[PDB]
């Protein structure tokens, strides 16, 4: 809990919403209070599953 | 030393705290909760109580920086 | 300047309420306290002087301090009624002199005895030999009435110190009317 | 008047460490200082304190003298840094007070209307909860003798607020805490009989001793009255105490039944879930 | 005084004990370890009476911790192979509330029982390895296991396997050291297996401990002995060439490369001669080498532990 | 010229005054002064801690009153121990105890009078109780930036001190500052009594008083408190008797929880407290 | 000449930064007070020893610390447009 606290202490963790997926392995992610972003793999989760 | 560890988990984060709006418990040890600022956050839940007082819809106190479920 | 800490003892015994000293022994010895406190002020600024009451149960009204305001404040409404106590009147001064900050300051005591004392000769000889080991020098000035041509106190001062020690001087007042400020003239010129 | 007092470990330590101050320089007597209390209700509370140089001559065995100017300056500093703190009385490390301590209170009674003196013990030995608390009152007497001032006992307890509990509990690193429900009540159960016995046994040896030596008074008056009060209770059946038997057991009736009620439930969840998680998890591995 | 005491170690000289007491009264802590270790070196195996009396009598009033540690290994080192003759002092060492003196009883009981499988020592040894508040004494407590049990290296991996999993890295460090010093004369693979996850712990210094321990298991043993030799040799250089790693952990990396390469690979360390008796310069050197942080010149005492392994066919004379 | 690992020896009396002076100042940062003795460069000890009076301007380099120091030092000279002051400490209640531009301004003032002058920060907030808490700092010389800044010797305590790192603000002090280790010393006699004082606090004075008052409690309203336990045992158990059936519906222990689950442990522990305090009756009331 | 030094000494007191205004929602315990800044965020925090719990009361405008986020001084009320009215 101490170490995990340290990784979530600075920025915490956000809540993403995928508006669209791209073939470049980069997935468009939109945050509600914020604008639209896009972020690359993410190898633990398969692209076809997104 | 385990009883002394309980004080290690109660030390964090102590005071002060920020109010947050709980959404739903996605899985064990972590759930998504809304900040009073309006930003929904993916948060690790404190280890002691994960269940009885969680409730689908309840106000919950979080840390300033981490926004951790306490 | 010479370093020392003086401790004055005002006489509140029930024999000091009479007006044999002009106008009264209360104001006579009060003016004596004024002249000695200003004398220590003109001597050294570092020397501090408290007061102690000998009669009844001895109590320190003012702890050792360089300012005389508190001393002059306690001289008033002192209610001088009680029995004189001597054997503990030197030891109280020594007791406040063991708590002193400065170790360079020598231990010095002045006291005014205006009433007869019941202290036996053996008690005073024990305190004489004790003050030799403690090196404490006490300068006494006898006031009021006592055994005619006071003896026990005189021999007490002589046997308290020796070689020289130049020393402790006991000035006995002669039985005659005079102003107090004129009685303190001889002790303030030379010990 | 005053009911009970609360003395923090911080101020208590502040007496002990000063005992280390005068310990190396010695020599005789005991540490004497002025206590700083905090009064929020009829219950009394102590937070900090300050030591004062004190020496008792022996000739003169009843001669006692304190520093008044130093008292003024130090109490003025503590009033400067803390407005809530004030002098509630004085303290000494004893271990046993002397007859001369009656006037010591009378001196500082000009500072505080009622000054409570607190004995403490720097070397823990016996017989239980430490320190002591005395209040200065005058009960006169039925004899019509001149008013005698005798200090009366005030119950003392060790406590703290928040931050003062931190360091105290942190520095021990010795015994389990607490632990409530298992080893908190049983250990104190033996403490009840042990601390009851030794208190009673030392004092009851005192009672037999008081009539042989220590007379006068001693006995009378306070002794015989409480004696008969001690003879007020035998104290058992006959009669109704016989009837408390089966209702005490009957209070145990439902408790044993509830015991056995949940004992089977513990064995239920444990054995069921474990035996499944044992054989059914091992069969997939091999 | 370290040169005088190491040169006269085991000689039981007299004049060295003279200037060592005035050096003990210099009151300086930086020379405290000098007087303390020298005093044990020259008196090694002599179980002197006034030596311990003066040392343990000087532990009280001194205000320094390095004089207390130097006297720790001092009174440890005078008492060698004395078996139960030293228990009378050991009782008083661990009963006392001084953290360093309880740390001294461990080294003392270590050298006095070296080569003995006496189980009477492991009762207090193990009990103090757990119930004690201080972490350094808990590390130095389990380091004694490899000193006494060096003759039977097969027991250490078994029994200490579970202590190597302890929650604090201090006991994990002592636990890696036990397998390091005890199994160094053997090619046991179980010890290596338990020292694999130790370098993976997120704690810094425990990884260092795994480096040196794994360096003692591989002395004179090439890749054909155990398959993890090259596995480890790439790790030693990897940790020292990465800037992100701690300087602490990368100290013991190059140090471990020095262990494997000691003497140009030609020499190794042996605590047990084939004759059946323990080699005291080896044991003494390594046991002082246990804590290299506290004094960096103490890392040179490991040179005495290096013994030549060679076949000498000298017929006679020159 | 010589830089080595350092160590702070604290007194049982010291910490207690630290956290107290710091608690009374919350939120506002206070100014304390550390008192002790310099034994050498690689070790230091604090044998005493005294509190400074607050000021309306706050923490500043001018907040130390020279006339107040000479007075207080008078009171400490006549005390058995007239030891020279060593350094200063200040509380940091609401954050992670980082040295600010006001702290550095008084660091260079203490480094000219005192060679070391260890900087100490104490806060009650960041720790419930059992933490060692506090902190300690030291000012490295800024004019040395051309030469090697990277000691020490005996790096053990250095490694344990710089850890955990532990966020960012903490790391922002690695430059221009370095911490210094803290370890308690005993003083185990007074510590032994200090344990028994708080523990005996829960115990009674005569010890037969509050236990017999719990015997007066042993039948109150305890038959009614046992009716409280009886309602918890009916109400929690008839809904915990559907759980063995529900385990067959979900198959088997997937999340969950409900709850409404367990809680009988606390009921059994309170009932056991009831039966033991009640078993004291036959011991006490009888003889 | 000396009045200027009086002003400059006032600057030394101006080295103390302000605080953030906030309204008292409720108090969970004596160590827990629920306060809400005018900006919208809520905070459960403590209080110092100068204030009284009875004098605070919910729905009271108070000033919170910049870091601890705790009450130091309070004000009864304020309103900026009315003065014009
Ligand atoms: Zn600051």
From Swiss-Prot, chain A:
Belongs to the AAA ATPase family. This is 26S proteasome regulatory subunit 8. It is found in: Cytoplasm; Nucleus. Component of the 19S proteasome regulatory particle complex. The 26S proteasome consists of a 20S core particle (CP) and two 19S regulatory subunits (RP). The regulatory particle is made of a lid composed of 9 subunits, a base containing 6 ATPases including PSMC5 and few additional components. Component of a complex with USP49 and RUVBL1. Interacts with PRPF19. Interacts with TRIM5. Interacts with NDC80. Interacts with PAAF1. Interacts, in vitro, with the thyroid hormone receptor (in a thyroid hormone T3-dependent manner) and with retinoid X receptor (RXR). Interacts with ERCC6. Component of the 26S proteasome, a multiprotein complex involved in the ATP-dependent degradation of ubiquitinated proteins. This complex plays a key role in the maintenance of protein homeostasis by removing misfolded or damaged proteins, which could impair cellular functions, and by removing proteins whose functions are no longer required. Therefore, the proteasome participates in numerous cellular processes, including cell cycle progression, apoptosis, or DNA damage repair.
Swiss-Prot record, chain C:
Component of the 26S proteasome, a multiprotein complex involved in the ATP-dependent degradation of ubiquitinated proteins. This complex plays a key role in the maintenance of protein homeostasis by removing misfolded or damaged proteins, which could impair cellular functions, and by removing proteins whose functions are no longer required. Therefore, the proteasome participates in numerous cellular processes, including cell cycle progression, apoptosis, or DNA damage repair. One of its GO terms (molecular function) is molecular adaptor activity. The 2 UIM motifs are involved in the binding to a multi-ubiquitin chain in a cooperative way. There is a cross-link at residue 122 (Glycyl lysine isopeptide (Lys-Gly) (interchain with G-Cter in SUMO2)). Residues 5-188 form the VWFA domain. This is 26S proteasome non-ATPase regulatory subunit 4. GO terms for biological process: proteasome-mediated ubiquitin-dependent protein catabolic process. Keywords: Isopeptide bond, Phosphoprotein, Proteasome, Repeat, Ubl conjugation. Belongs to the proteasome subunit S5A family. The chain holds residues 1 to 191 of 377 of the full protein. The keyword Phosphoprotein applies. GO terms for cellular component: cytosol; nucleoplasm; nucleus; proteasome accessory complex; proteasome complex; proteasome regulatory particle, base subcomplex. It comes from Homo sapiens.
Curated annotation (Swiss-Prot), chain D:
Pfam families: JAB, MitMem_reg. One of its GO terms (biological process) is proteasome-mediated ubiquitin-dependent protein catabolic process. The modification N6-acetyllysine is found at residues 200, 210. CDD domains: MPN_RPN7_8. GO terms for cellular component: cytosol; extracellular exosome; extracellular region; ficolin-1-rich granule lumen; membrane; nucleoplasm; nucleus; proteasome complex. It comes from the Eukaryota. Keywords: Acetylation, Isopeptide bond, Proteasome, Ubl conjugation. InterPro entries: EIF3F/CSN6-like_C (IPR024969), JAMM/MPN+_dom (IPR000555), MPN (IPR037518), MPN_RPN7_8 (IPR033858). There is a cross-link at residue 176 (Glycyl lysine isopeptide (Lys-Gly) (interchain with G-Cter in ubiquitin)). Residues 5-140 form the MPN domain. Component of the 26S proteasome, a multiprotein complex involved in the ATP-dependent degradation of ubiquitinated proteins. This complex plays a key role in the maintenance of protein homeostasis by removing misfolded or damaged proteins, which could impair cellular functions, and by removing proteins whose functions are no longer required. Therefore, the proteasome participates in numerous cellular processes, including cell cycle progression, apoptosis, or DNA damage repair. Belongs to the peptidase M67A family. Does not bind a metal ion. PANTHER family: 26S PROTEASOME NON-ATPASE REGULATORY SUBUNIT 7, EUKARYOTIC TRANSLATION INITIATION FACTOR 3 SUBUNIT F-RELATED. This is 26S proteasome non-ATPase regulatory subunit 7. It comes from Homo sapiens.
UniProtKB/Swiss-Prot annotation, chain F:
It comes from Homo sapiens (Human). PANTHER family: EUKARYOTIC TRANSLATION INITIATION FACTOR 3 -RELATED (PTHR10410). GO terms for cellular component: cytosol; cytosolic proteasome complex; extracellular region; ficolin-1-rich granule lumen; nucleoplasm; nucleus; proteasome accessory complex; proteasome complex. Zn(2+) binds at residues 90, 92, 103. Keywords: DNA damage, DNA repair, Hydrolase, Metal-binding, Metalloprotease, Phosphoprotein, Protease, Proteasome, Ubl conjugation pathway, Zinc. One of its GO terms (molecular function) is metallopeptidase activity. Pfam families: JAB (PF01398), RPN11_C (PF23594). The modification Phosphothreonine is found at residue 243. One of its GO terms (biological process) is response to ethanol. The keyword Chaperone does not apply. This is 26S proteasome non-ATPase regulatory subunit 14. Coiled coil: none annotated. It is an enzyme of class 3 (hydrolase).
């Amino acid at each position: 809990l101490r170490e995990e606290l340290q990784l979530l202490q600075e920025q915490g963790s956000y809540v993403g919403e995928v508006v669209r997926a791209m073939d470049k392995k980069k997935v468009l992610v939109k945050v509600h209070p914020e604008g639209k972003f896009v972020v690359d793999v993410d190898k633990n989760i398969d692209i076809n599953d997104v | 030393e385990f009883l002394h560890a309980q004080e290690e988990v109660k030390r964090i984060q102590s005071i002060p705290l920020v109010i947050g709006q709980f959404l739903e418990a996605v899985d064990q040890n972590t759930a998504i909760v809304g900040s009073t600022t309006g930003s929904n956050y993916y948060v690790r839940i404190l280890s002691t109580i994960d269940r009885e007082l969680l409730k689908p819809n309840a106000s919950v106190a979080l840390h300033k920086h981490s926004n951790a479920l306490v | 300047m010479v370093l020392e800490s003086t401790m004055v003892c005002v006489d509140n015994s029930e024999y000091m309420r009479n007006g044999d000293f002009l106008p009264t022994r209360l104001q006579a010895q009060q003016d004596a306290v004024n002249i000695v406190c200003h004398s220590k002020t003109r001597s050294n600024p570092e020397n501090n002087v408290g007061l102690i009451t000998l009669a009844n149960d001895c109590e320190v009204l003012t702890t050792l301090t360089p300012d005389t305001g508190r001393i002059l404040s306690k001289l008033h409404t002192v209610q001088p009624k009680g029995k004189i106590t001597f054997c503990t009147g030197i030891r109280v001064a020594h007791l406040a002199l063991k708590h002193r900050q400065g170790k360079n300051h020598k231990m010095r005591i002045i006291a005014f005895v205006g009433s007869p004392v019941e202290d036996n000769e053996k008690d005073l000889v024990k305190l004489a030999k004790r003050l030799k080991k403690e090196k404490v020098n006490v300068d006494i000035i006898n006031f009021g009435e006592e055994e005619v041509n006071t003896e026990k106190l005189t021999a007490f001062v002589n046997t308290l110190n020796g070689k020289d020690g130049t020393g402790s001087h006991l000035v006995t007042v002669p039985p005659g009317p005079s102003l107090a400020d004129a009685l303190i003239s001889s002790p303030i010129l030379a010990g | 008047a005053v009911q009970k007092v609360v003395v923090h470990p911080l101020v208590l330590l502040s007496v002990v460490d000063h005992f280390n101050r005068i310990g190396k320089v010695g020599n005789q007597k005991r540490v004497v200082g002025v206590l700083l209390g905090s009064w929020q209700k009829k219950v009394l509370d102590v937070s900090n304190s300050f030591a004062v140089p004190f020496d008792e001559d022996d000739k003169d065995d009843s001669v006692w003298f304190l520093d008044h100017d130093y008292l003024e300056n130090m109490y003025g500093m503590f009033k400067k840094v803390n407005a809530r703190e004030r002098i509630v009385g004085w303290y000494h490390t004893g271990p046993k007070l002397h007859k001369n301590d009656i006037a010591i209170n009378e001196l500082m009674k000009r500072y505080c209307p009622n000054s409570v003196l607190v004995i403490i013990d720097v070397k823990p030995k016996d017989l239980g909860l430490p320190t002591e608390a005395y209040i200065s009152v005058e009960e006169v007497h039925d004899d019509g003798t001149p008013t005698s001032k005798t200090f009366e006992h005030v119950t003392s307890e060790i406590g703290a607020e928040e931050a003062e509990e931190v360091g105290v509990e942190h520095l021990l690193r010795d015994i389990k805490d607490t632990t409530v429900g298992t080893l908190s009540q049983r250990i104190t159960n033996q403490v009840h009989g042990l601390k009851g016995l030794n208190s009673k046994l030392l004092d009851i040896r005192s009672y037999l001793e008081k009539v042989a030596t220590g007379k006068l008074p001693i006995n009378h008056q306070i002794i015989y009255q409480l004696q008969d009060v001690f003879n007020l209770l035998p104290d058992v059946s006959l009669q109704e105490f016989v009837k408390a038997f089966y209702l005490k057991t009957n209070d145990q009736m439902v408790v044993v039944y509830l015991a056995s009620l949940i004992r089977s439930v513990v064995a239920l969840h444990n054995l069921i879930n474990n035996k499944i998680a044992n054989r059914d998890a091992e069969k997939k591995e091999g | 005084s370290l040169g005088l005491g190491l040169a006269a170690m085991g000689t039981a000289r007299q004049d060295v004990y003279d200037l060592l007491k005035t050096n003990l009264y210099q009151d300086d802590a930086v020379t405290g370890e000098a007087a303390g270790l020298a005093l044990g070196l020259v008196m090694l195996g002599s179980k002197n009476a006034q030596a311990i009396e003066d040392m343990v009598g000087y532990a009280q009033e001194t205000q320094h911790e390095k004089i207390l540690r130097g006297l720790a290994v001092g009174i440890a080192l005078v008492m060698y192979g004395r078996m139960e003759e030293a228990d009378a002092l050991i009782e008083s060492l661990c009963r006392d509330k001084d953290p360093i003196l309880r740390r001294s009883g461990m080294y003392t009981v270590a050298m006095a029982y070296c080569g003995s499988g006496n189980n009477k020592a492991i009762r207090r040894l193990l009990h103090v390895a757990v119930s004690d508040v201080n972490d350094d004494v808990r590390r130095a407590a389990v380091e004694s296991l490899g000193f006494i049990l060096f003759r039977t290296p097969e027991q250490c991996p078994s029994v200490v396997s579970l202590l190597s999993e302890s929650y604090n890295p201090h006991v994990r460090y002592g636990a890696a050291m036990a397998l390091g010093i005890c199994c160094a004369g053997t090619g046991n693979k179980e010890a290596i297996n338990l020292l694999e996850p130790m370098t993976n712990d997120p704690v810094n210094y425990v990884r260092q401990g795994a480096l040196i321990a794994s360096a003692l298991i591989m002395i004179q043993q090439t890749e054909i002995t155990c398959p993890k030799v090259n596995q480890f040799r790439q790790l030693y250089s990897k940790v020292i060439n990465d800037k992100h790693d701690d300087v602490m952990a990368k100290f013991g990396a190059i140090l471990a490369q020095g262990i494997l390469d000691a003497g140009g690979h030609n020499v190794t360390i042996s605590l047990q001669s084939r004759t059946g008796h323990t080699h005291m310069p080896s044991v003494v050197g390594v046991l002082v080498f246990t804590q290299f942080w506290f004094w960096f010149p103490l890392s040179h005492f490991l040179s005495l532990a290096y013994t030549p392994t060679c076949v000498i066919g000298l017929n006679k004379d020159l | 010229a010589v830089d080595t690992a350092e160590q702070v020896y604290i007194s049982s009396l010291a910490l207690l005054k630290m956290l107290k002076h710091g608690r009374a100042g919350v939120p506002m940062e206070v100014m304390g002064l550390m008192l002790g003795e310099f034994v050498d460069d690689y070790t230091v000890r604090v044998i005493d801690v005294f509190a400074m009076p607050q000021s309306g301007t706050g923490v500043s380099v001018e907040a130390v009153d020279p006339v107040f120091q000479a007075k207080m030092l008078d009171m400490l000279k006549q005390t058995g121990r007239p030891e020279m002051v060593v350094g200063w400490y200040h509380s940091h209640p609401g954050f992670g105890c980082w040295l600010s531009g006001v702290d550095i301004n008084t660091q260079q003032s203490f480094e000219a009078l005192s060679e070391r002058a260890v900087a100490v920060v104490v806060d009650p907030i960041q720790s419930v109780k059992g933490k060692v808490v506090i902190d300690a700092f030291r000012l490295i010389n800024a004019n040395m930036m051309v030469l090697g800044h990277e000691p020490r010797q005996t790096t053990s305590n250095l490694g344990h001190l710089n850890k955990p790192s532990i966020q960012a603000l903490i790391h922002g002090l690695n430059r221009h500052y370095y911490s210094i280790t803290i370890n308690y010393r005993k003083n185990e006699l007074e510590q032994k009594m200090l344990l028994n004082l708080h523990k005996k606090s829960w115990m009674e004075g005569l010890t037969l008083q509050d236990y017999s008052e719990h015997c007066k409690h042993n039948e109150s309203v305890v038959k009614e408190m046992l009716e409280l336990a009886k309602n918890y045992n009916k109400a929690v158990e008839e809904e915990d008797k559907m759980t063995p059936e529900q385990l067959a519906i979900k198959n088997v222990g997937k999340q969950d929880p409900k709850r409404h689950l367990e809680e009988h442990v606390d009921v059994l522990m309170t009932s056991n407290i009831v039966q033991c305090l009640a078993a004291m009756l036959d011991t006490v009331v009888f003889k | 000449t000396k009045q200027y030094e009086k002003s400059e000494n006032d600057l030394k007191a101006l080295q103390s930064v302000g605080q953030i205004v906030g309204e008292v929602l409720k108090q969970l315990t004596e160590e827990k007070f629920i306060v809400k800044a005018t900006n919208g965020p809520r905070y459960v925090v403590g209080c110092r020893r100068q204030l009284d719990k009875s004098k605070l009361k919910p729905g009271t405008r108070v000033a919170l610390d910049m870091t601890t986020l705790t009450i130091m001084r309070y004000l009864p009320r304020e309103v900026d447009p009315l003065v014009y009215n």
